[model samples]
Target: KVFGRCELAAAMKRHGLDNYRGYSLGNWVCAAKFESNFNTQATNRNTDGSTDYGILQINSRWWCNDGRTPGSRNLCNIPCSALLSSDITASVNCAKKIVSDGNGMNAWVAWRNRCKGTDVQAWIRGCRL
Candidate 1:
């Protein structure tokens, strides 16, 4: 869908992101790639395949089975699929948490950047696209 602030905000609200920001845009991409190869709806229920769905790959059955029902209110109230398809800020925020406490998103600011050896690719890699 062609997203604007309104559309994105609706999704963000549905996904429990009342205060979502692009704090870890770089690491968010890396985490998504590492988790579900950027597949926003990938669900692999196996020891080898993905354990969940979306860029964050949150567990679907579990989210629902654990009494997380869909409602017009809380985003966590919906199915995991909704979470995946809706806003992505939640997952990105989760990834950001990993680097929130005085540690910038390591996947973007450190690892991805360091891997490129401080070059143009490195510059392009960590920067918020």
Candidate 2:
């Protein structure tokens, strides 16, 4: 709830989201835009009983555990609450790990659906960073 597109772009740039394990900043920006609209506190429940966390909408089943969930990969070794903070360090770190697993940005459905083959530049258009 505390960032616009420009702010998110700057933060991502500062976090080195671009070219991290071959993922582009444009894809990250577009995925974040579609997944959470740059809102750090975002959470979405899926039909399959897993939930997505934070700006990247990372899945509980595969990436994070909210504690209430019985089983989760919790691969980042951080609480799901960490992903919901205004600061995105934990989320970005987790995303980097996910991307590095050879999945790349394709790990994010938002990127595949909303960003792939699209004008991804528009996601970071006019950003000062």
Candidate 3:
């Protein structure tokens, strides 16, 4: 499923991404904009042959198991396929772990360049909730 601005906002809000780990909901949603463009089935293959999946674009090399990336960490204990689901809860959940594990929002380059240093309120304006 492709999510609208407010659509992703409502889902993140319900799943506890609002202000989670010092990053605001807009931060997550903003990363989703550049990372996956709110598409649930998005996938981008890196040069190392690892793939990034879903809205937050979680990588299989470390965060999820694709059972193909050599020396894969599978830190999230979730299949990369799970990231492709329209239900974004898994993406949000794993993102939380990414933050708590000390990588923080900048783990996603899009988040660092777009959401961290920029004004992300624009990412939230239409979604007042």
Task: Output the number of the lDDT-best candidate.
Answer: 3
Which portions of model 3 show Cα errors greater than 4 Å? none
The C-alpha RMSD of each candidate to the native structure, in angstroms, is 8.8, 1.2, 1.0
lDDT at 37, model 3: 94
- Candidate 2: segments with Cα more than 4 A from true spot: none
Over 50-101, each residue of candidate 2 has an lDDT whose tens digit, in order, gives 8898999888887777876666678888788889998999899999988887
Candidate number with the higher TM-score (1 or 2): 2
Report the CA-based lDDT of candidate 2 relative to the real structure. Answer: 0.85
Write down the TM-score of every candidate: 0.41, 0.93, 0.96
Q: Candidate 3 — what's its lDDT? A: 0.90
Better candidate by TM-score, 1 or 3 = 3
Against the unseen true structure, what C-alpha lDDT does each candidate score?
A: 0.42, 0.85, 0.90
CA shift of 122, model 1, Å: 4.3
lDDT (tens digit, per residue) of candidate 3 on 42-93: 9999999999999999989888999889997998899999999999989999
Worst 10 residues of 1 by lDDT: 115-124
> Per-residue lDDT for 1-129 in model 1, tens only?
223333433443455433334332333433444556555566656343224555555543333222332231222444444535545754544433434435444433333453322222221243222
Model number with the top TM-score: 3
